[PDB]
Amino acid sequence: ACTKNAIAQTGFNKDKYFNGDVWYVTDYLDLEPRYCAALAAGTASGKLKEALYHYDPKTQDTFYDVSELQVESLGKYTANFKKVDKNGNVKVAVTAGNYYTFTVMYADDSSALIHTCLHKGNKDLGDLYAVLNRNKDAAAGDKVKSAVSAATLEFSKFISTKENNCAYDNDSLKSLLTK
Ligand code: HEM
């Protein structure tokens, strides 16, 4: 189960974060303990949208999702996801009880720290923190590392995705925002 009420960044700039571009997960911290992951976040016809990509570089398990985000407060969202192929074709429809929360704890032009809590079926899932960068496999800079510290988290405990053989379809993620 999830246990954290993540606090959103003071002065979070939603237009900057939800600008339609891609964010790569570079490091993650599972509170209830290996995929590569990335997302696009943007607006489509006035709605906040995210497209997600997960890839397991060992098993090859791959899946995409599209979500409309509902606002709880600035920088804190609830998202109902639908599983899609890379083209946006629906594989699993939206269903009540299948959702994640998403909190942006820190963001700037190139980096972010987020918290997410996934609810899926009758699985018992836990909190996940992720460091994001606009550039694939970029080493975490001083600003986001300081934000990790300021959140009372130990960055050395995070797991890096940067050494995995992952490729990302940026074009697909961006186009999924409209789906
Ligand atoms: C490297 C970071 C991440 C890892 C290692 C990871 C791992 C996983 C795993 C193993 C699953 C399968 C769960 C199951 O069905 O048993 C999953 C599903 C999911 N994750 Fe992540 N995840 C990561 C990042 C994220 C992020 C940042 C988000 C949201 C912004 C997210 C949202 C989701 C959603 C919505 C599903 C269910 C998708 C579906 O069934 O259609 N994940 N993740």
Side-chain angles (χ1 to χ4, degrees), residues 147-178:
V148 171
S149 182
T152 311
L153 299 170
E154 175 50 53
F155 188 59
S156 64
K157 304 290 185 182
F158 283 60
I159 301 302
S160 166
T161 66
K162 307 184 290 300
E163 299 74 20
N164 303 328
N165 192 166
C166 5
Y168 303 86
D169 191 338
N170 307 331
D171 294 318
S172 291
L173 276 176
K174 292 186 170 193
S175 50
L176 281 180
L177 288 179
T178 66

PDB file of all heavy atoms in Angstrom, residues 147-178:
ATOM      1  N   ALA A 147      16.884  18.559  -4.111  1.00  0.00           N
ATOM      2  CA  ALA A 147      15.454  18.394  -3.874  1.00  0.00           C
ATOM      3  C   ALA A 147      15.165  17.040  -3.239  1.00  0.00           C
ATOM      4  O   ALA A 147      14.297  16.922  -2.366  1.00  0.00           O
ATOM      5  CB  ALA A 147      14.660  18.556  -5.177  1.00  0.00           C
ATOM      6  N   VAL A 148      15.907  16.022  -3.669  1.00  0.00           N
ATOM      7  CA  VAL A 148      15.787  14.694  -3.077  1.00  0.00           C
ATOM      8  C   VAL A 148      16.152  14.752  -1.598  1.00  0.00           C
ATOM      9  O   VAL A 148      15.400  14.273  -0.749  1.00  0.00           O
ATOM     10  CB  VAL A 148      16.662  13.662  -3.828  1.00  0.00           C
ATOM     11  CG1 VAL A 148      16.709  12.332  -3.085  1.00  0.00           C
ATOM     12  CG2 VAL A 148      16.116  13.460  -5.237  1.00  0.00           C
ATOM     13  N   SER A 149      17.291  15.369  -1.294  1.00  0.00           N
ATOM     14  CA  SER A 149      17.690  15.578   0.095  1.00  0.00           C
ATOM     15  C   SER A 149      16.627  16.355   0.881  1.00  0.00           C
ATOM     16  O   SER A 149      16.292  15.993   2.012  1.00  0.00           O
ATOM     17  CB  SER A 149      19.037  16.308   0.167  1.00  0.00           C
ATOM     18  OG  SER A 149      19.459  16.480   1.517  1.00  0.00           O
ATOM     19  N   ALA A 150      16.098  17.421   0.285  1.00  0.00           N
ATOM     20  CA  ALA A 150      15.164  18.301   0.986  1.00  0.00           C
ATOM     21  C   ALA A 150      13.848  17.595   1.299  1.00  0.00           C
ATOM     22  O   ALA A 150      13.106  17.999   2.206  1.00  0.00           O
ATOM     23  CB  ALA A 150      14.916  19.579   0.174  1.00  0.00           C
ATOM     24  N   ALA A 151      13.566  16.549   0.528  1.00  0.00           N
ATOM     25  CA  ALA A 151      12.405  15.703   0.750  1.00  0.00           C
ATOM     26  C   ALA A 151      12.680  14.646   1.825  1.00  0.00           C
ATOM     27  O   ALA A 151      11.817  13.826   2.140  1.00  0.00           O
ATOM     28  CB  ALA A 151      11.997  15.036  -0.555  1.00  0.00           C
ATOM     29  N   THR A 152      13.892  14.671   2.371  1.00  0.00           N
ATOM     30  CA  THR A 152      14.314  13.726   3.399  1.00  0.00           C
ATOM     31  C   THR A 152      14.495  12.322   2.816  1.00  0.00           C
ATOM     32  O   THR A 152      14.264  11.320   3.494  1.00  0.00           O
ATOM     33  CB  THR A 152      13.346  13.713   4.620  1.00  0.00           C
ATOM     34  OG1 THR A 152      13.091  15.058   5.051  1.00  0.00           O
ATOM     35  CG2 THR A 152      13.952  12.946   5.779  1.00  0.00           C
ATOM     36  N   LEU A 153      14.910  12.262   1.551  1.00  0.00           N
ATOM     37  CA  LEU A 153      15.248  10.992   0.904  1.00  0.00           C
ATOM     38  C   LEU A 153      16.749  10.904   0.662  1.00  0.00           C
ATOM     39  O   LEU A 153      17.413  11.922   0.501  1.00  0.00           O
ATOM     40  CB  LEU A 153      14.512  10.851  -0.435  1.00  0.00           C
ATOM     41  CG  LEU A 153      12.987  10.854  -0.389  1.00  0.00           C
ATOM     42  CD1 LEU A 153      12.433  10.948  -1.804  1.00  0.00           C
ATOM     43  CD2 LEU A 153      12.436   9.612   0.329  1.00  0.00           C
ATOM     44  N   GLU A 154      17.269   9.679   0.629  1.00  0.00           N
ATOM     45  CA  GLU A 154      18.685   9.440   0.399  1.00  0.00           C
ATOM     46  C   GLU A 154      18.901   9.009  -1.050  1.00  0.00           C
ATOM     47  O   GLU A 154      18.509   7.912  -1.445  1.00  0.00           O
ATOM     48  CB  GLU A 154      19.202   8.374   1.371  1.00  0.00           C
ATOM     49  CG  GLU A 154      20.637   7.956   1.141  1.00  0.00           C
ATOM     50  CD  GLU A 154      21.575   9.142   1.034  1.00  0.00           C
ATOM     51  OE1 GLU A 154      21.570   9.991   1.956  1.00  0.00           O
ATOM     52  OE2 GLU A 154      22.316   9.221   0.026  1.00  0.00           O
ATOM     53  N   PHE A 155      19.514   9.881  -1.842  1.00  0.00           N
ATOM     54  CA  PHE A 155      19.660   9.615  -3.266  1.00  0.00           C
ATOM     55  C   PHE A 155      20.464   8.350  -3.567  1.00  0.00           C
ATOM     56  O   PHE A 155      20.218   7.682  -4.573  1.00  0.00           O
ATOM     57  CB  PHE A 155      20.256  10.823  -3.990  1.00  0.00           C
ATOM     58  CG  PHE A 155      20.258  10.686  -5.477  1.00  0.00           C
ATOM     59  CD1 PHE A 155      19.073  10.490  -6.168  1.00  0.00           C
ATOM     60  CD2 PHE A 155      21.447  10.738  -6.193  1.00  0.00           C
ATOM     61  CE1 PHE A 155      19.067  10.355  -7.547  1.00  0.00           C
ATOM     62  CE2 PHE A 155      21.446  10.601  -7.575  1.00  0.00           C
ATOM     63  CZ  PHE A 155      20.249  10.412  -8.251  1.00  0.00           C
ATOM     64  N   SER A 156      21.403   7.999  -2.694  1.00  0.00           N
ATOM     65  CA  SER A 156      22.200   6.796  -2.922  1.00  0.00           C
ATOM     66  C   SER A 156      21.358   5.520  -2.880  1.00  0.00           C
ATOM     67  O   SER A 156      21.808   4.457  -3.302  1.00  0.00           O
ATOM     68  CB  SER A 156      23.365   6.701  -1.929  1.00  0.00           C
ATOM     69  OG  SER A 156      22.897   6.556  -0.597  1.00  0.00           O
ATOM     70  N   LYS A 157      20.132   5.624  -2.378  1.00  0.00           N
ATOM     71  CA  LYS A 157      19.241   4.468  -2.310  1.00  0.00           C
ATOM     72  C   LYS A 157      18.483   4.265  -3.622  1.00  0.00           C
ATOM     73  O   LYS A 157      17.908   3.196  -3.858  1.00  0.00           O
ATOM     74  CB  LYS A 157      18.242   4.625  -1.159  1.00  0.00           C
ATOM     75  CG  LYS A 157      18.859   4.860   0.212  1.00  0.00           C
ATOM     76  CD  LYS A 157      19.547   3.625   0.730  1.00  0.00           C
ATOM     77  CE  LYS A 157      20.042   3.842   2.154  1.00  0.00           C
ATOM     78  NZ  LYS A 157      20.762   2.647   2.669  1.00  0.00           N
ATOM     79  N   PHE A 158      18.446   5.293  -4.466  1.00  0.00           N
ATOM     80  CA  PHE A 158      17.753   5.166  -5.747  1.00  0.00           C
ATOM     81  C   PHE A 158      18.469   4.167  -6.645  1.00  0.00           C
ATOM     82  O   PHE A 158      19.677   3.967  -6.521  1.00  0.00           O
ATOM     83  CB  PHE A 158      17.659   6.510  -6.481  1.00  0.00           C
ATOM     84  CG  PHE A 158      16.610   7.449  -5.939  1.00  0.00           C
ATOM     85  CD1 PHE A 158      16.659   7.894  -4.623  1.00  0.00           C
ATOM     86  CD2 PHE A 158      15.602   7.934  -6.768  1.00  0.00           C
ATOM     87  CE1 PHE A 158      15.704   8.774  -4.131  1.00  0.00           C
ATOM     88  CE2 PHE A 158      14.639   8.827  -6.280  1.00  0.00           C
ATOM     89  CZ  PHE A 158      14.701   9.254  -4.962  1.00  0.00           C
ATOM     90  N   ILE A 159      17.707   3.551  -7.548  1.00  0.00           N
ATOM     91  CA  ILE A 159      18.230   2.649  -8.567  1.00  0.00           C
ATOM     92  C   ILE A 159      18.314   3.401  -9.891  1.00  0.00           C
ATOM     93  O   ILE A 159      17.355   4.051 -10.298  1.00  0.00           O
ATOM     94  CB  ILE A 159      17.307   1.424  -8.736  1.00  0.00           C
ATOM     95  CG1 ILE A 159      17.165   0.666  -7.405  1.00  0.00           C
ATOM     96  CG2 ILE A 159      17.793   0.509  -9.868  1.00  0.00           C
ATOM     97  CD1 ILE A 159      18.458   0.176  -6.822  1.00  0.00           C
ATOM     98  N   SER A 160      19.465   3.324 -10.550  1.00  0.00           N
ATOM     99  CA  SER A 160      19.669   3.991 -11.832  1.00  0.00           C
ATOM    100  C   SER A 160      19.173   3.137 -12.994  1.00  0.00           C
ATOM    101  O   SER A 160      19.345   1.919 -12.991  1.00  0.00           O
ATOM    102  CB  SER A 160      21.155   4.286 -12.038  1.00  0.00           C
ATOM    103  OG  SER A 160      21.418   4.622 -13.385  1.00  0.00           O
ATOM    104  N   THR A 161      18.563   3.780 -13.988  1.00  0.00           N
ATOM    105  CA  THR A 161      18.135   3.086 -15.198  1.00  0.00           C
ATOM    106  C   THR A 161      19.128   3.318 -16.331  1.00  0.00           C
ATOM    107  O   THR A 161      18.983   2.755 -17.412  1.00  0.00           O
ATOM    108  CB  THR A 161      16.760   3.584 -15.685  1.00  0.00           C
ATOM    109  OG1 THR A 161      16.873   4.950 -16.108  1.00  0.00           O
ATOM    110  CG2 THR A 161      15.721   3.476 -14.580  1.00  0.00           C
ATOM    111  N   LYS A 162      20.134   4.149 -16.073  1.00  0.00           N
ATOM    112  CA  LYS A 162      20.972   4.688 -17.137  1.00  0.00           C
ATOM    113  C   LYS A 162      21.883   3.648 -17.779  1.00  0.00           C
ATOM    114  O   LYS A 162      22.329   3.825 -18.916  1.00  0.00           O
ATOM    115  CB  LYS A 162      21.792   5.874 -16.614  1.00  0.00           C
ATOM    116  CG  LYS A 162      20.948   6.962 -15.945  1.00  0.00           C
ATOM    117  CD  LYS A 162      21.793   8.170 -15.537  1.00  0.00           C
ATOM    118  CE  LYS A 162      22.717   7.848 -14.374  1.00  0.00           C
ATOM    119  NZ  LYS A 162      21.950   7.424 -13.157  1.00  0.00           N
ATOM    120  N   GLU A 163      22.152   2.566 -17.052  1.00  0.00           N
ATOM    121  CA  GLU A 163      23.069   1.534 -17.522  1.00  0.00           C
ATOM    122  C   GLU A 163      22.332   0.383 -18.200  1.00  0.00           C
ATOM    123  O   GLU A 163      22.946  -0.582 -18.645  1.00  0.00           O
ATOM    124  CB  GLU A 163      23.936   1.012 -16.370  1.00  0.00           C
ATOM    125  CG  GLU A 163      24.825   2.083 -15.724  1.00  0.00           C
ATOM    126  CD  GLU A 163      24.046   3.054 -14.847  1.00  0.00           C
ATOM    127  OE1 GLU A 163      22.925   2.706 -14.422  1.00  0.00           O
ATOM    128  OE2 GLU A 163      24.555   4.165 -14.578  1.00  0.00           O
ATOM    129  N   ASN A 164      21.009   0.487 -18.274  1.00  0.00           N
ATOM    130  CA  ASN A 164      20.222  -0.501 -18.995  1.00  0.00           C
ATOM    131  C   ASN A 164      20.242  -0.193 -20.486  1.00  0.00           C
ATOM    132  O   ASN A 164      20.305   0.966 -20.890  1.00  0.00           O
ATOM    133  CB  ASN A 164      18.785  -0.522 -18.471  1.00  0.00           C
ATOM    134  CG  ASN A 164      18.718  -0.787 -16.981  1.00  0.00           C
ATOM    135  OD1 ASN A 164      19.556  -1.501 -16.431  1.00  0.00           O
ATOM    136  ND2 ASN A 164      17.727  -0.208 -16.317  1.00  0.00           N
ATOM    137  N   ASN A 165      20.193  -1.230 -21.306  1.00  0.00           N
ATOM    138  CA  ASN A 165      20.134  -1.047 -22.746  1.00  0.00           C
ATOM    139  C   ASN A 165      18.701  -0.722 -23.150  1.00  0.00           C
ATOM    140  O   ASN A 165      17.984  -1.590 -23.649  1.00  0.00           O
ATOM    141  CB  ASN A 165      20.600  -2.326 -23.447  1.00  0.00           C
ATOM    142  CG  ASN A 165      20.848  -2.133 -24.936  1.00  0.00           C
ATOM    143  OD1 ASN A 165      21.464  -2.984 -25.584  1.00  0.00           O
ATOM    144  ND2 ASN A 165      20.381  -1.020 -25.484  1.00  0.00           N
ATOM    145  N   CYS A 166      18.264   0.514 -22.914  1.00  0.00           N
ATOM    146  CA  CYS A 166      16.909   0.922 -23.299  1.00  0.00           C
ATOM    147  C   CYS A 166      16.907   1.916 -24.445  1.00  0.00           C
ATOM    148  O   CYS A 166      17.800   2.751 -24.560  1.00  0.00           O
ATOM    149  CB  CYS A 166      16.086   1.503 -22.131  1.00  0.00           C
ATOM    150  SG  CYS A 166      16.898   1.744 -20.541  1.00  0.00           S
ATOM    151  N   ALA A 167      15.889   1.807 -25.285  1.00  0.00           N
ATOM    152  CA  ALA A 167      15.661   2.740 -26.364  1.00  0.00           C
ATOM    153  C   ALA A 167      14.267   3.254 -26.119  1.00  0.00           C
ATOM    154  O   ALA A 167      13.438   2.557 -25.524  1.00  0.00           O
ATOM    155  CB  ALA A 167      15.734   2.037 -27.705  1.00  0.00           C
ATOM    156  N   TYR A 168      14.004   4.468 -26.575  1.00  0.00           N
ATOM    157  CA  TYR A 168      12.725   5.099 -26.340  1.00  0.00           C
ATOM    158  C   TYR A 168      12.177   5.628 -27.651  1.00  0.00           C
ATOM    159  O   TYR A 168      12.920   6.160 -28.472  1.00  0.00           O
ATOM    160  CB  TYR A 168      12.888   6.260 -25.351  1.00  0.00           C
ATOM    161  CG  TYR A 168      13.488   5.840 -24.030  1.00  0.00           C
ATOM    162  CD1 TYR A 168      14.865   5.772 -23.855  1.00  0.00           C
ATOM    163  CD2 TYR A 168      12.675   5.488 -22.967  1.00  0.00           C
ATOM    164  CE1 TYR A 168      15.410   5.373 -22.650  1.00  0.00           C
ATOM    165  CE2 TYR A 168      13.209   5.101 -21.753  1.00  0.00           C
ATOM    166  CZ  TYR A 168      14.572   5.044 -21.599  1.00  0.00           C
ATOM    167  OH  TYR A 168      15.092   4.648 -20.387  1.00  0.00           O
ATOM    168  N   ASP A 169      10.873   5.488 -27.849  1.00  0.00           N
ATOM    169  CA  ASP A 169      10.247   6.039 -29.033  1.00  0.00           C
ATOM    170  C   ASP A 169       9.615   7.373 -28.671  1.00  0.00           C
ATOM    171  O   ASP A 169       8.444   7.428 -28.306  1.00  0.00           O
ATOM    172  CB  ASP A 169       9.182   5.090 -29.566  1.00  0.00           C
ATOM    173  CG  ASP A 169       8.692   5.487 -30.941  1.00  0.00           C
ATOM    174  OD1 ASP A 169       8.838   6.673 -31.312  1.00  0.00           O
ATOM    175  OD2 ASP A 169       8.166   4.608 -31.653  1.00  0.00           O
ATOM    176  N   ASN A 170      10.399   8.441 -28.766  1.00  0.00           N
ATOM    177  CA  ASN A 170       9.926   9.769 -28.400  1.00  0.00           C
ATOM    178  C   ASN A 170       8.733  10.199 -29.226  1.00  0.00           C
ATOM    179  O   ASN A 170       7.795  10.811 -28.711  1.00  0.00           O
ATOM    180  CB  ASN A 170      11.035  10.800 -28.591  1.00  0.00           C
ATOM    181  CG  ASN A 170      12.298  10.422 -27.879  1.00  0.00           C
ATOM    182  OD1 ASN A 170      12.257   9.748 -26.854  1.00  0.00           O
ATOM    183  ND2 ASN A 170      13.438  10.849 -28.415  1.00  0.00           N
ATOM    184  N   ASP A 171       8.793   9.916 -30.521  1.00  0.00           N
ATOM    185  CA  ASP A 171       7.721  10.324 -31.412  1.00  0.00           C
ATOM    186  C   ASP A 171       6.416   9.674 -31.005  1.00  0.00           C
ATOM    187  O   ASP A 171       5.380  10.330 -30.969  1.00  0.00           O
ATOM    188  CB  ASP A 171       8.064  10.008 -32.865  1.00  0.00           C
ATOM    189  CG  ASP A 171       9.234  10.826 -33.362  1.00  0.00           C
ATOM    190  OD1 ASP A 171       9.286  12.031 -33.048  1.00  0.00           O
ATOM    191  OD2 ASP A 171      10.111  10.260 -34.041  1.00  0.00           O
ATOM    192  N   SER A 172       6.460   8.386 -30.687  1.00  0.00           N
ATOM    193  CA  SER A 172       5.250   7.717 -30.242  1.00  0.00           C
ATOM    194  C   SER A 172       4.702   8.321 -28.957  1.00  0.00           C
ATOM    195  O   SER A 172       3.504   8.548 -28.845  1.00  0.00           O
ATOM    196  CB  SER A 172       5.472   6.215 -30.077  1.00  0.00           C
ATOM    197  OG  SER A 172       5.666   5.614 -31.345  1.00  0.00           O
ATOM    198  N   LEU A 173       5.571   8.590 -27.988  1.00  0.00           N
ATOM    199  CA  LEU A 173       5.096   9.117 -26.718  1.00  0.00           C
ATOM    200  C   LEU A 173       4.424  10.464 -26.906  1.00  0.00           C
ATOM    201  O   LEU A 173       3.372  10.732 -26.319  1.00  0.00           O
ATOM    202  CB  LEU A 173       6.234   9.248 -25.710  1.00  0.00           C
ATOM    203  CG  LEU A 173       6.594   8.004 -24.914  1.00  0.00           C
ATOM    204  CD1 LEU A 173       7.807   8.291 -24.044  1.00  0.00           C
ATOM    205  CD2 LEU A 173       5.406   7.544 -24.070  1.00  0.00           C
ATOM    206  N   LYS A 174       5.028  11.316 -27.724  1.00  0.00           N
ATOM    207  CA  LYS A 174       4.453  12.636 -27.959  1.00  0.00           C
ATOM    208  C   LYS A 174       3.113  12.541 -28.677  1.00  0.00           C
ATOM    209  O   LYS A 174       2.168  13.253 -28.330  1.00  0.00           O
ATOM    210  CB  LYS A 174       5.420  13.526 -28.732  1.00  0.00           C
ATOM    211  CG  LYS A 174       6.656  13.916 -27.945  1.00  0.00           C
ATOM    212  CD  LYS A 174       7.482  14.922 -28.723  1.00  0.00           C
ATOM    213  CE  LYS A 174       8.589  15.512 -27.868  1.00  0.00           C
ATOM    214  NZ  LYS A 174       9.199  16.715 -28.519  1.00  0.00           N
ATOM    215  N   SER A 175       3.015  11.665 -29.672  1.00  0.00           N
ATOM    216  CA  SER A 175       1.763  11.555 -30.416  1.00  0.00           C
ATOM    217  C   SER A 175       0.653  10.921 -29.579  1.00  0.00           C
ATOM    218  O   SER A 175      -0.529  11.180 -29.807  1.00  0.00           O
ATOM    219  CB  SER A 175       1.966  10.813 -31.745  1.00  0.00           C
ATOM    220  OG  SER A 175       2.658   9.594 -31.556  1.00  0.00           O
ATOM    221  N   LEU A 176       1.033  10.109 -28.596  1.00  0.00           N
ATOM    222  CA  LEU A 176       0.048   9.467 -27.726  1.00  0.00           C
ATOM    223  C   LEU A 176      -0.729  10.471 -26.881  1.00  0.00           C
ATOM    224  O   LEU A 176      -1.801  10.156 -26.362  1.00  0.00           O
ATOM    225  CB  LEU A 176       0.715   8.444 -26.811  1.00  0.00           C
ATOM    226  CG  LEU A 176       1.041   7.093 -27.435  1.00  0.00           C
ATOM    227  CD1 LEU A 176       1.699   6.178 -26.408  1.00  0.00           C
ATOM    228  CD2 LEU A 176      -0.218   6.450 -28.015  1.00  0.00           C
ATOM    229  N   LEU A 177      -0.192  11.675 -26.724  1.00  0.00           N
ATOM    230  CA  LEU A 177      -0.863  12.664 -25.879  1.00  0.00           C
ATOM    231  C   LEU A 177      -2.276  12.999 -26.354  1.00  0.00           C
ATOM    232  O   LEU A 177      -3.110  13.472 -25.569  1.00  0.00           O
ATOM    233  CB  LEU A 177      -0.018  13.941 -25.758  1.00  0.00           C
ATOM    234  CG  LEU A 177       1.236  13.808 -24.890  1.00  0.00           C
ATOM    235  CD1 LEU A 177       2.007  15.115 -24.868  1.00  0.00           C
ATOM    236  CD2 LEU A 177       0.887  13.367 -23.464  1.00  0.00           C
ATOM    237  N   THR A 178      -2.547  12.760 -27.632  1.00  0.00           N
ATOM    238  CA  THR A 178      -3.837  13.118 -28.207  1.00  0.00           C
ATOM    239  C   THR A 178      -4.808  11.948 -28.200  1.00  0.00           C
ATOM    240  O   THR A 178      -5.952  12.085 -28.642  1.00  0.00           O
ATOM    241  CB  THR A 178      -3.688  13.576 -29.670  1.00  0.00           C
ATOM    242  OG1 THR A 178      -3.246  12.469 -30.471  1.00  0.00           O
ATOM    243  CG2 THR A 178      -2.684  14.717 -29.773  1.00  0.00           C
TER     244      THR A 178
END
